[PDB]
Design an enzyme around this catalytic site. Structure first.
Site, PDB file in Angstrom:
ATOM      1  N   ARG A   1       0.839  -1.195   0.000  1.00 59.24           N
ATOM      2  CA  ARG A   1       0.000   0.000   0.000  1.00 59.24           C
ATOM      3  C   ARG A   1       0.876   1.248   0.000  1.00 59.24           C
ATOM      4  O   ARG A   1       1.648   1.464   0.936  1.00 59.24           O
ATOM      5  CB  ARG A   1      -0.936   0.002   1.208  1.00 59.24           C
ATOM      6  CG  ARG A   1      -1.769   1.264   1.329  1.00 59.24           C
ATOM      7  CD  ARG A   1      -2.841   1.137   2.407  1.00 59.24           C
ATOM      8  NE  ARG A   1      -2.268   1.045   3.747  1.00 59.24           N
ATOM      9  CZ  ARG A   1      -1.743   2.076   4.403  1.00 59.24           C
ATOM     10  NH1 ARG A   1      -1.700   3.281   3.835  1.00 59.24           N
ATOM     11  NH2 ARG A   1      -1.237   1.902   5.617  1.00 59.24           N
TER      12      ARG A   1
ATOM     13  N   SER B   1      -8.218  -1.683   0.538  1.00 55.97           N
ATOM     14  CA  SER B   1      -9.232  -2.064   1.519  1.00 55.97           C
ATOM     15  C   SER B   1     -10.066  -0.873   2.002  1.00 55.97           C
ATOM     16  O   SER B   1     -10.841  -0.299   1.232  1.00 55.97           O
ATOM     17  CB  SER B   1      -8.568  -2.783   2.699  1.00 55.97           C
ATOM     18  OG  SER B   1      -9.515  -3.462   3.504  1.00 55.97           O
ATOM     19  N   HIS B   2      -9.911  -0.496   3.265  1.00 55.26           N
ATOM     20  CA  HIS B   2     -10.707   0.551   3.889  1.00 55.26           C
ATOM     21  C   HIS B   2      -9.989   1.892   3.920  1.00 55.26           C
ATOM     22  O   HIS B   2     -10.535   2.871   4.455  1.00 55.26           O
ATOM     23  CB  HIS B   2     -11.075   0.125   5.304  1.00 55.26           C
ATOM     24  CG  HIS B   2      -9.888  -0.286   6.111  1.00 55.26           C
ATOM     25  ND1 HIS B   2      -9.252  -1.497   5.931  1.00 55.26           N
ATOM     26  CD2 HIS B   2      -9.195   0.369   7.072  1.00 55.26           C
ATOM     27  CE1 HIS B   2      -8.233  -1.581   6.766  1.00 55.26           C
ATOM     28  NE2 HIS B   2      -8.177  -0.463   7.470  1.00 55.26           N
TER      29      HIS B   2
ATOM     30  N   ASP C   1     -16.651  -2.615   3.864  1.00 58.53           N
ATOM     31  CA  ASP C   1     -15.466  -1.822   3.563  1.00 58.53           C
ATOM     32  C   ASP C   1     -15.172  -1.847   2.063  1.00 58.53           C
ATOM     33  O   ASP C   1     -15.902  -2.434   1.264  1.00 58.53           O
ATOM     34  CB  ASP C   1     -14.254  -2.297   4.371  1.00 58.53           C
ATOM     35  CG  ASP C   1     -13.710  -3.609   3.884  1.00 58.53           C
ATOM     36  OD1 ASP C   1     -14.486  -4.405   3.277  1.00 58.53           O
ATOM     37  OD2 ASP C   1     -12.496  -3.842   4.108  1.00 58.53           O
TER      38      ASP C   1
ATOM     39  N   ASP D   1     -13.082  -3.151  -0.087  1.00 61.15           N
ATOM     40  CA  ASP D   1     -12.912  -4.368  -0.872  1.00 61.15           C
ATOM     41  C   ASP D   1     -13.818  -5.508  -0.423  1.00 61.15           C
ATOM     42  O   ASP D   1     -13.754  -6.592  -1.006  1.00 61.15           O
ATOM     43  CB  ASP D   1     -11.452  -4.821  -0.856  1.00 61.15           C
ATOM     44  CG  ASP D   1     -10.985  -5.232   0.527  1.00 61.15           C
ATOM     45  OD1 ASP D   1     -11.346  -4.571   1.535  1.00 61.15           O
ATOM     46  OD2 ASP D   1     -10.255  -6.227   0.615  1.00 61.15           O
TER      47      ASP D   1
ATOM     48  N   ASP E   1     -14.401  -7.317   2.584  1.00 60.67           N
ATOM     49  CA  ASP E   1     -14.184  -8.407   3.513  1.00 60.67           C
ATOM     50  C   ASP E   1     -14.541  -8.030   4.937  1.00 60.67           C
ATOM     51  O   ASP E   1     -14.448  -8.881   5.823  1.00 60.67           O
ATOM     52  CB  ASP E   1     -12.757  -8.961   3.403  1.00 60.67           C
ATOM     53  CG  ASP E   1     -11.656  -7.937   3.731  1.00 60.67           C
ATOM     54  OD1 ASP E   1     -11.853  -6.697   3.692  1.00 60.67           O
ATOM     55  OD2 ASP E   1     -10.551  -8.431   4.007  1.00 60.67           O
ATOM     56  N   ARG E   2     -15.047  -6.818   5.164  1.00 60.69           N
ATOM     57  CA  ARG E   2     -15.423  -6.360   6.497  1.00 60.69           C
ATOM     58  C   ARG E   2     -16.896  -5.982   6.493  1.00 60.69           C
ATOM     59  O   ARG E   2     -17.456  -5.624   5.454  1.00 60.69           O
ATOM     60  CB  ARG E   2     -14.514  -5.164   6.962  1.00 60.69           C
ATOM     61  CG  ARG E   2     -13.274  -5.633   7.740  1.00 60.69           C
ATOM     62  CD  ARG E   2     -12.007  -4.777   7.602  1.00 60.69           C
ATOM     63  NE  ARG E   2     -12.064  -3.513   8.318  1.00 60.69           N
ATOM     64  CZ  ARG E   2     -11.039  -2.985   8.983  1.00 60.69           C
ATOM     65  NH1 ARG E   2      -9.867  -3.619   9.047  1.00 60.69           N
ATOM     66  NH2 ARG E   2     -11.187  -1.820   9.596  1.00 60.69           N
TER      67      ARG E   2
ATOM     68  N   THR F   1      -3.552 -12.089  15.738  1.00 64.94           N
ATOM     69  CA  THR F   1      -4.129 -11.269  14.683  1.00 64.94           C
ATOM     70  C   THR F   1      -3.477 -11.623  13.350  1.00 64.94           C
ATOM     71  O   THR F   1      -2.242 -11.680  13.254  1.00 64.94           O
ATOM     72  CB  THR F   1      -3.926  -9.777  15.007  1.00 64.94           C
ATOM     73  OG1 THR F   1      -4.695  -9.411  16.165  1.00 64.94           O
ATOM     74  CG2 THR F   1      -4.353  -8.890  13.838  1.00 64.94           C
TER      75      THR F   1
ATOM     76  N   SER G   1     -12.356  -6.509  14.646  1.00 65.31           N
ATOM     77  CA  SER G   1     -12.286  -5.459  13.628  1.00 65.31           C
ATOM     78  C   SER G   1     -13.229  -5.705  12.443  1.00 65.31           C
ATOM     79  O   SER G   1     -12.826  -5.540  11.283  1.00 65.31           O
ATOM     80  CB  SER G   1     -10.846  -5.302  13.122  1.00 65.31           C
ATOM     81  OG  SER G   1     -10.320  -6.564  12.734  1.00 65.31           O
TER      82      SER G   1
ATOM     83  N   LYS H   1     -11.916 -13.180   4.437  1.00 66.23           N
ATOM     84  CA  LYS H   1     -13.156 -12.824   5.115  1.00 66.23           C
ATOM     85  C   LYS H   1     -14.166 -12.302   4.090  1.00 66.23           C
ATOM     86  O   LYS H   1     -13.814 -11.952   2.961  1.00 66.23           O
ATOM     87  CB  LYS H   1     -12.897 -11.786   6.208  1.00 66.23           C
ATOM     88  CG  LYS H   1     -12.201 -12.342   7.455  1.00 66.23           C
ATOM     89  CD  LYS H   1     -11.651 -11.215   8.335  1.00 66.23           C
ATOM     90  CE  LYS H   1     -10.479 -10.486   7.666  1.00 66.23           C
ATOM     91  NZ  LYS H   1     -10.721  -9.020   7.481  1.00 66.23           N
TER      92      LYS H   1
HETATM   93  O1  LIG Z   1      -1.839  -4.942  13.699  1.00 68.42           O
HETATM   94  P1  LIG Z   1      -3.091  -4.077  13.687  1.00 68.42           P
HETATM   95  O2  LIG Z   1      -2.717  -2.661  13.481  1.00 68.42           O
HETATM   96  O3  LIG Z   1      -3.862  -4.222  15.029  1.00 68.42           O
HETATM   97  O4  LIG Z   1      -4.075  -4.442  12.363  1.00 68.42           O
HETATM   98  C1  LIG Z   1      -4.614  -5.719  12.191  1.00 68.42           C
HETATM   99  C2  LIG Z   1      -5.612  -5.567  11.098  1.00 68.42           C
HETATM  100  O5  LIG Z   1      -4.903  -5.258   9.841  1.00 68.42           O
HETATM  101  C3  LIG Z   1      -5.815  -5.183   8.700  1.00 68.42           C
HETATM  102  O6  LIG Z   1      -6.563  -4.011   8.793  1.00 68.42           O
HETATM  103  C4  LIG Z   1      -6.768  -6.392   8.595  1.00 68.42           C
HETATM  104  O7  LIG Z   1      -7.872  -6.012   7.756  1.00 68.42           O
HETATM  105  C5  LIG Z   1      -7.326  -6.884   9.884  1.00 68.42           C
HETATM  106  O8  LIG Z   1      -7.716  -8.313   9.700  1.00 68.42           O
HETATM  107  C6  LIG Z   1      -6.393  -6.870  11.015  1.00 68.42           C
HETATM  108  O9  LIG Z   1      -7.144  -7.024  12.245  1.00 68.42           O
HETATM  109 MG   LIG Z   2     -11.003  -5.003   3.651  1.00 69.11          MG
END
Ligand SMILES: O=P(O)(O)OC[C@H]1O[C@H](O)[C@H](O)[C@@H](O)[C@@H]1O
Ligand SMILES: [Mg+2]
Length: 564
Positions: A25, A119-120, A290, A292, A294-295, A359, A380, A391
């Site tokens: 990204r 993604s978001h 979101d 793409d 998956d959320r 995670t 999340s 997802k």
């Molecule tokens: O490591 P973090 O900042 O808590 O992010 C973890 C997140 O990264 C992305 O956004 C994914 O979409 C999520 O599946 C995941 O929970």
């Molecule tokens: Mg997404």
């Protein structure tokens, strides 16, 4: 223009083209102003495919519709062709949700896919662009493959490209390209963005039951917000055209290159329009996806907020309302470690295994590929099943609609019934964004050393009427039962004898200085306490979390940036 030359372009390597769990990204302006930035990276992905395997290989390509996606898809085709990749399958107009790409890779046994999505994160000329690589199981490339891509990208000196090759992304069918001095043709299939994914969902869910739920006099009234992102046309063709929801049910369902100028991120502030709509009381069910797809966020009448940790517990407890699970069975449940324990209550009651993972997707997909995981959830706004290897937000909505159709209760009454049966895990996540790294790292190192001392288990913390006793405190470690990997320093847990937990993590999605994520999971059995405001019920545990971590003293923050 169906016969095109193959040329070699000398290029200069960049040093930062490092895919993470969710791809590469960068800001759009970086892709635009760094010569050959995308070309280098696309070439690097393809170089991971052995030349002898390229002719018979298919790559699936699509994205979430954000600015720069179509230019990037053309570049993928130009380079894929020149590198001897046999075939690309591309969504019409470049459009493929992230769950659809996973579906199609697995359906046609592609070697993988390149998803054009951040993604978001926002898009448009001033926003972000992302390039994800998924492999033949339809899931994200694991770290052994993304490391090789990164290595290749750092020393790449040339790429092969077909500069005159142009794909018409807007017309369905097979486009062939004869390459100068290559015997076999390069082939592009433009497929409908929604067809294969919809066909998959048609076998998972009971579209007859859903069509009856969503159509006519006593129809369940729904409002589905794709936030101007990739799920839009999926909503329109599946929920409206096929299942008969009126057309006003699909809001923000035209993909926009800048996502309407907003973050395509489903939560109570970024999807405030959906929330305000739901407050009116006219609609029974609301959801947001979101960028793409998956959320998902799930809302009930009056804007009732189903928090994602509860949402996967509810689906788990009504899982056989979904014909897929009627027929495959339930091989297991999983949630990320910071997600609330609501899922555990359901899995314990039904004697199904509960996997608590660090995670990250790879832990879920590992268990799915071993036939051990049917339903997974992330606080999340992530819910998924083993129908694919990402997802799936729209899947989770259809799961919900199926449960509503068999239960014949409102969303809120289903939750109240759930909490009365299993007890309620009140849950919130505090995000402290862009705290100085030294303070945050010190806060974590100190807290961990406090927890490791012999006296810490058994210590008692009280706040109001509540007393919490430490049952266990650790820095979460996970020995993955499939690939053998050991994941360490995955988050500091304070586990109390009553079922409650405090969890601290430092975010691994680095912004500019650390962000702290504090998860509060307070279990409550008392019926006169299960229907209270969550922030009120979580205050005792929040007080303890701040006190024991010394977060305000370490960071200067008196308040999180975001409460979820
Ligand atoms: O490591 P973090 O900042 O808590 O992010 C973890 C997140 O990264 C992305 O956004 C994914 O979409 C999520 O599946 C995941 O929970
Ligand atoms: Mg997404």
């Amino acid at each position: 223009s169906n016969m095109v030359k193959i040329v070699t372009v000398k290029t200069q390597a960049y040093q930062d083209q490092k895919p993470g769990t969710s791809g590469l990204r960068k800001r759009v302006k970086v892709f635009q102003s760094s010569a050959n930035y995308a070309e280098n990276f696309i070439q690097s992905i393809i170089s991971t495919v052995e030349p002898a395997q390229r002719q018979e290989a298919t790559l699936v390509v699509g994205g979430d519709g954000r600015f720069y996606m179509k230019e990037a898809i053309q570049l993928i085709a130009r380079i894929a062709a020149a590198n001897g990749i046999g075939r690309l399958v591309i969504g019409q107009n470049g459009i493929l949700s992230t769950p659809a790409v996973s579906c199609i890779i697995r359906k046609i046994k592609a070697i993988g896919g390149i998803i054009l999505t951040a993604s978001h994160n926002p898009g448009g000329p001033n926003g972000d662009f992302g390039i994800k690589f998924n492999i033949s199981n339809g899931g994200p490339a694991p770290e052994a493959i993304t490391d090789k891509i990164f290595q290749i990208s750092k020393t790449i000196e040339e790429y092969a490209v077909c500069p005159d090759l142009k794909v018409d992304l807007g017309v369905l069918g097979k486009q062939q390209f004869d390459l100068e001095n290559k015997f076999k043709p390069f082939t592009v299939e433009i497929v409908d963005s929604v067809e294969a994914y919809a066909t998959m969902l048609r076998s998972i869910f009971d579209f007859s039951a859903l069509k009856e739920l969503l159509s006519g006099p006593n129809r369940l009234k729904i409002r589905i917000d794709a936030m101007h992102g990739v799920v839009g046309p999926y909503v329109k063709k599946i929920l409206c055209e096929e299942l008969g929801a009126p057309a006003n049910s699909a809001v923000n369902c035209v993909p926009l290159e800048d996502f309407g100028g907003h973050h395509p991120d489903p939560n109570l502030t970024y999807a405030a329009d959906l929330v305000e709509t739901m407050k009116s009381g006219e609609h029974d069910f609301g959801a947001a996806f979101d960028g793409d797809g998956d959320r998902n966020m799930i809302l009930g009448k009056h804007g009732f907020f189903v928090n994602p940790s509860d949402s996967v517990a509810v689906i788990a407890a009504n899982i056989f309302s979904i014909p897929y699970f009627q027929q495959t069975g339930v091989r297991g449940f999983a949630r990320s470690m910071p997600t609330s324990g609501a899922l555990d209550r359901v899995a314990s009651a039904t004697k199904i295994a509960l996997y608590e993972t660090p995670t990250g997707w790879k832990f879920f997909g590992n268990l799915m590929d071993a036939s051990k995981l049917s339903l997974c959830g992330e606080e999340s706004f992530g819910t998924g099943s083993d129908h694919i290897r990402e997802k799936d937000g729209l899947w989770a909505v259809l799961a919900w609609l199926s449960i509503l159709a068999t239960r014949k209760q409102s969303v809120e009454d289903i939750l109240k019934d759930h909490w009365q049966k299993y007890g309620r895990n009140f849950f919130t996540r505090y995000d402290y964004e862009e705290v100085e790294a030294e303070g945050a790292n010190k806060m974590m190192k100190d807290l961990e050393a406090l927890m490791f001392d012999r006296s810490f288990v058994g210590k008692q913390f009280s706040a109001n009427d509540k007393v919490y006793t430490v049952e266990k405190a650790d820095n979460f470690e996970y020995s993955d039962p499939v690939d053998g990997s050991i994941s360490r320093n995955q988050g500091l847990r304070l586990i109390f004898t009553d079922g409650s937990r405090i969890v601290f993590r430092l975010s691994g999605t680095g912004s500019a200085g650390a962000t702290i994520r504090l998860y509060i999971d307070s279990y409550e059995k008392d019926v006169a306490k299960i229907n209270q405001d969550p922030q009120v019920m979580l205050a005792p545990l929040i007080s303890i979390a701040l006190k024991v971590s010394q977060l305000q003293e370490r960071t200067g923050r008196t308040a999180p940036t975001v409460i979820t």
